[model samples]
Target: YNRLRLQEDVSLRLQRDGALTVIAADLLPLALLNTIIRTLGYPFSNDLMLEARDRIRAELPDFTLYKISPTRFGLLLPRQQQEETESVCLRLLRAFESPVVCRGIPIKANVGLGVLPLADDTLDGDQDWLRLVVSAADDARDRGVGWARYNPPLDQAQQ
Candidate 1:
């Protein structure tokens, strides 16, 4: 329930980044990004996710950011190559390379990265697509890969 709005144009609406909005008509979606997977083992009091937000904002200033839930975040990349989007996710994973030091205590967050390609407008809705990509990333995390892309066949099988 984060500033949800109905979007008339998908490309223009993506400028809002991570927040959720509806789409209309036909438009090519470049990338669907779900950044945060889960909270890290470290207990942080003041917005541990802020570290991630900052890193992503810095790494890919053009991408959109979303707060799907308390511990989850998303990003939408329009007009970007899939390889470039994956590279962005990798950079995000590296951001945690250094622990976030708040009040002289070091805290770390274990985040999983998920990405989906929206080459067409056949998908039902953005939320559905987001869930799929997040699930794929979760699978990658389960396998200790840290990140993964959406595979339709595998996703359908799981479903």
Candidate 2:
């Protein structure tokens, strides 16, 4: 599966470079698509999803776009500096600033990003890294922020 492949790839890359960043991008307003489907129809909702995917692809052409969930994407940046990774996150945040107009309706496609640096000594295993990033993305959405860095203490407290 894609998740297994990503974990394997990250493990290998971490062994080689000892540094990497995992980003989890999640679409906000979890019920947006469902609301669209209820108001307009399935076709319109599909169009909006496609539109949002395309916009993300456009913003991050260099990285692989993994559809981790219905409204979530995962990206890996190997050997990238923290500043550059933050810049990438900002770029992605800006990509969704404008609404995706579908059939004359401006549907807001807001996104929040969670960044996790792979060099953390506290990381228990490769599998947990992705989960943490996803949680961070959720935290960002909950905080109404563009992005958030993974915090182990906060994550543990929430658990």
Candidate 2 positional error at 136, Å? 0.7
Candidate 2 local lDDT, 10-34, one digit each (tens)? 7877877777888888876568757
lDDT of 2 at 38: 94
Clashes of 2: 0
Each prediction's Cα lDDT score? 0.49, 0.78
lDDT of 1 by residue, 52-141 (tens): 566656876776666554555666555534446656666777876677555555655556666655543443334345566657666665
TM-score of each model, paired residue for residue = 0.63, 0.81
Spell out the clash pairs found in candidate 1.
Answer: 17-64, 17-65, 18-65, 18-66
